[PDB]
Design a protein around this ligand. Structure first.
Ligand SMILES: [Ag+]
Length: 75
């Protein structure tokens, strides 16, 4: 779209199911308060090495009921 930047903390990562759970700060761009959400990852998501408990900066777009990561790095 409509790429949306957020920050948060990694709560869980699963490269098998292709999900990363992030506790993120509010996102006024889409009227989300503080929440823990599953973000979808693809072979195309630009990744740095991130671990559970890491503080992260990330970009994502929305399409379907999926929130799809375009990249993610450690903050
Ligand atoms: Ag959310």
């Amino acid at each position: 779209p409509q790429v949306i930047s957020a920050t948060g903390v990694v709560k869980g990562i699963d490269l098998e199911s292709k999900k990363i759970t992030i506790h993120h700060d509010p996102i006024a761009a889409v009227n989300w308060p503080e929440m823990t959400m599953r973000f979808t990852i693809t072979p195309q998501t630009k990744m740095s090495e991130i671990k559970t408990g890491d503080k992260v900066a990330f970009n994502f777009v929305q399409q379907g009921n999926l929130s799809l990561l375009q990249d993610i790095k450690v903050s």
